[PDB]
Design a protein around this motif. Structure first.
Motif, short mmCIF file in Angstrom:
data_model
loop_
_atom_site.label_atom_id
_atom_site.label_comp_id
_atom_site.label_asym_id
_atom_site.label_seq_id
_atom_site.Cartn_x
_atom_site.Cartn_y
_atom_site.Cartn_z
N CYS A 17 0.87 -1.17 0.00
CA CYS A 17 0.00 0.00 0.00
C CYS A 17 0.92 1.24 0.00
O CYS A 17 1.92 1.27 0.74
CB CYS A 17 -0.91 -0.01 1.22
SG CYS A 17 -2.07 1.39 1.34
N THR A 19 -0.10 4.16 1.10
CA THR A 19 -0.53 5.06 2.16
C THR A 19 -0.61 4.43 3.49
O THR A 19 -0.98 5.09 4.44
CB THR A 19 -1.86 5.72 1.77
OG1 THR A 19 -2.83 4.74 1.35
CG2 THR A 19 -1.59 6.68 0.58
N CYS A 20 -0.26 3.16 3.62
CA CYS A 20 -0.10 2.56 4.97
C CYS A 20 0.91 1.48 4.79
O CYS A 20 1.25 1.18 3.68
CB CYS A 20 -1.41 2.01 5.55
SG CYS A 20 -2.09 0.50 4.78
N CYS A 42 -4.78 0.69 -0.45
CA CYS A 42 -5.49 -0.55 -0.10
C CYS A 42 -6.87 -0.22 0.47
O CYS A 42 -7.18 0.91 0.83
CB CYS A 42 -4.66 -1.35 0.94
SG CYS A 42 -4.75 -0.86 2.66
N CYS A 45 -7.18 1.69 3.67
CA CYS A 45 -7.04 3.17 3.43
C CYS A 45 -8.29 3.79 2.81
O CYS A 45 -8.72 4.89 3.21
CB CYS A 45 -5.80 3.46 2.54
SG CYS A 45 -4.32 3.12 3.51
#
Ligand SMILES: [Zn+2]
Ligand SMILES: [Zn+2]
Ligand SMILES: [Zn+2]
Length: 178
Positions: A17, A19-20, A42, A45
């Motif tokens: 991912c 963003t995480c 994902c 997120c």
């Protein structure tokens, strides 16, 4: 990023991912991890974003209202996530693929159901309302309970249903009650 799949906890060909720190096998993620898209976010997120865009979406709801919602993009996504959360439990292996029924003293269910079939149904947009998804999910466990009767294996159905139900209440922000 993580070096194991968030869903199955195995290493392999993972997609990370942007963003995480979570990672996925291609077909462990739901929907399946998208061909291009840089960056990629994902489903965890994407769900977080919905909540942050509309904080009031976390106020309590009535299940009866949730079930009648149409499967617009955001409900579609929430159902995909709920399904993913069930697959995250290792006991989901018992309910993933198509079952069969030959046990002395029991008869198979009228309408067999399994997680992969629900997965295909979501992918092919066969549910028009949340109710459709939730009915099939609950049918999986209910068929299991009925078939296995007094065998202690019935408890697997109880355990996985509890995972489903807790996550349903969380994801769809069902009003808390005793
Ligand atoms: Zn995996
Ligand atoms: Zn993420
Ligand atoms: Zn707002």
């Amino acid at each position: 990023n993580s070096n194991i799949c968030e869903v199955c906890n195995k290493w392999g060909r993972l997609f990370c991912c942007d963003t995480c720190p979570r990672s996925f096998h291609e077909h462990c993620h739901i929907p399946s991890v998208e061909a291009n898209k840089n960056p990629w976010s994902c489903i965890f997120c994407r769900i977080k974003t919905i909540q942050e865009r509309c904080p009031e979406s976390q106020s309590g709801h009535q299940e009866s209202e949730v079930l009648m919602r149409q499967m617009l993009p955001e409900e579609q996504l929430k159902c995909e996530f709920l399904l993913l959360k069930v697959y995250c439990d290792s006991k989901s292996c018992f309910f993933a693929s198509e079952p069969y029924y030959n046990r002395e003293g029991s008869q198979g269910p009228q309408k067999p159901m399994w997680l992969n079939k629900v997965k295909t149904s979501l992918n092919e947009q066969m549910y028009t309302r949340v109710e459709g998804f939730v009915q099939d999910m609950r049918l999986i466990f209910h068929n299991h309970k009925e078939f296995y009767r007094e065998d202690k294996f019935t408890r697997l159905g109880i355990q996985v249903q509890d995972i489903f139900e807790k996550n349903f209440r969380n994801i769809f922000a069902i009003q808390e009650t005793s």
